[PDB]
Amino acid sequence: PALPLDQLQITHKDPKTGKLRTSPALHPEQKADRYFVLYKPPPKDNIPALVEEYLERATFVANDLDWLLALPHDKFWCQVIFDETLQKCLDSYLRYVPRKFDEGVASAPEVVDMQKRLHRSVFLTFLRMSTHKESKDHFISPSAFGEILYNNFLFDIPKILDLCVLFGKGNSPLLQKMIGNIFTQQPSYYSDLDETLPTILQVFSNILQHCGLQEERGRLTPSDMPLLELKDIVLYLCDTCTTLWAFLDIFPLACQTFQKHDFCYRLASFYEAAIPEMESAIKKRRLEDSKLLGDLWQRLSHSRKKLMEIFHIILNQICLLPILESSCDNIQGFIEEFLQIFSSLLQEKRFLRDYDALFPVAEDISLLQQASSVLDETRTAYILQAVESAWEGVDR
Amino acid sequence: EFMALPRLTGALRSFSNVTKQDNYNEEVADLKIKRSKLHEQVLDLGLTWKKIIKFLNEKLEKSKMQSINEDLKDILHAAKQIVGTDNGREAIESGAAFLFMTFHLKDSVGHKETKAIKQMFGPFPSSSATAACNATNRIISHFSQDDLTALVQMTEKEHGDRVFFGKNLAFSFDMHDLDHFDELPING
């Protein structure tokens, strides 16, 4: 038979001369003594001296990771569990590696090739750790596996978000499997997500509070504020929206955790507060910097699109998808949740107009009307007359 | 500075890990201890020393093997100087294999090769890099070009025959980018 790793025993010599004691497979000194250095991203322009510093550090990391992938199931898991340098190195890479949507220079092919090496190797390492059944002989007990995962800080919530925004465009179906597996084997990440949501939302208010939009004594609106402070604000916002959206694109089961914290309304009202002022400021000050302001405009429009996509992903997951499936005809609560969500943002006319332009409301209301045997126009009319007036305020 | 760029997961880490952000207040203590232990970290490269002399003897006539053995002794001496004698015989032989493979396709000492040797064994006398490169090019001057492609194919094959987790898996380098929208129109 095949014995799972957590409970498998290997014989090893004890401190005492010439004495063998059977002991667990995983153990601190069965780990290898390979040191792991932290990752630092490349310089912003191809300054030769800085490039080679980055290259030195990066080759240490990549060689260590190549060897780590070469390792066997028993010794690889020993290393990942007991070597703190390894996990901190991977956290370093995930935290600091440049994202594609970032402001990017072309650099020497050496840095590009090396960066590709690191990208692939890091993804494969995280795949190995997300899998609890490497194959028939080499596997780990589900309950013990999730304990290991959560609790040698192998998977944070930040690291999961980083993983998605970094590897989700190309390798989605695999990363879906990974994330779903770690959440299945250790469900306390949900709680982690829960506890993290207040900080996430705090991010948004901070952005508002930094533009004086809403205890930060009156800061300057985007029209007045210094240019590269505004640049930082919209860069932060773009990174935040892209990361959240990528996470929910990989793992939509998280959405209810989000909506437990009134997320649909929070991002709708944030949209209403933030988007108009920043739009007008970018437009007005475009000629202060031709190229910078156009980039900021691209990022702002990207952020608005990603915000609305987040909104619709949550709406679908907790109302629309449950109605389409499992039609035993007890969908009133789902319907009522939909109606409540929209009643709470009737007044957010600018967000309503743009959101309706992208995911039309009438098409999702008809889903509820089709599914419910007994849904009168009374229950949705006002919502549509909100949408209508939201458009009618502007000349299109 | 890209360590400066504002990231959501950066804020998330800062909020619950104040502890750990200046926990990594470590620079050349950090990398130095790596240098301290990198001496035995490289087991081998593409082709080991025994594989190299097997190839050389298998492809060349005894006529030229006579001189090629003195060339290989020059390379062994250069590795002895670079690696040092206290790690032992097999260590300097793998260093000699590393030297040969470093210069088997290059006819001079360049920034790439000096930096590679330094990465592998720390600081070293460059005179020995010159000696090893000269001996290697002396040896390769006896290769026919079919022989040279055989050597290249052999290096490529063994690098390809290496097995690691997820090696044959499909992987994409496509990363999430900015969606294309359109420039703020002209104002006025």
Author numbering:
A (entry chain B): 2 to 215, 227 to 408
B (entry chain A): -1 to 186
Question: What sentences appear in the manuscript?
Answer:
Several lines of evidence implicate the human activating signal co-integrator complex (ASCC) in AlkBH3-mediated DNA repair. ASCC and alkylated nucleotides co-localize at nuclear foci upon alkylation damage stress, dependent on a coupling of ubiquitin conjugation to ER degradation (CUE) domain in ASCC2, which links DNA alkylation damage repair to upstream ubiquitin signaling via the RING finger protein 113A9. As a member of the Ski2-like family of superfamily (SF) 2 nucleic acid helicases, ASCC3 shows striking resemblance to the pre-mRNA splicing factor Brr2 (sequence identity of 41/33% between human ASCC3 and human/yeast Brr2), an ATP-dependent RNA helicase that is essential for spliceosome activation, catalysis and disassembly.
Here, we mapped precise interacting regions of the two largest ASCC subunits, ASCC2 and ASCC3, and determined a crystal structure of an ASCC2–ASCC3 complex comprising these portions. Guided by the structure, we delineated segments and residues that are critical for the ASCC2–ASCC3 interaction, which include a large number of residues that are altered by somatic cancer mutations. The importance of regions for the interaction scales with the degree of their evolutionary conservation. Moreover, we observed that a large number of ASCC2 and ASCC3 residue substitutions encoded by somatic mutations in cancers map to ASCC2–ASCC3 interface regions and that selected, cancer-related residue substitutions in ASCC3 lead to reduced ASCC2–ASCC3 affinity. Our structural analysis revealed that ASCC3 and Brr2 share at least some structural organization in their NTRs as well. Both contain a plug/plug-like domain close to their N-termini (residues 59–142 in human ASCC3, 113–192 in yeast Brr2, 107–180 in human Brr2). Based on our crystal structure, regions neighboring the ASCC3 plug-like domain are expected to be guided away from the ASCC3 helicase region when bound to ASCC2, however, ASCC2 did not alleviate ASCC3 auto-inhibition. Correlation of the evolutionary conservation of ASCC2–ASCC3 interfaces and the contributions of these regions to a stable interaction underscore the functional importance of the complex we structurally analyzed. Based on these observations and previous insights into the role of ASCC components in DNA alkylation damage repair, we suggest that reduced ASCC2–ASCC3 affinity might contribute to malignant transformation.
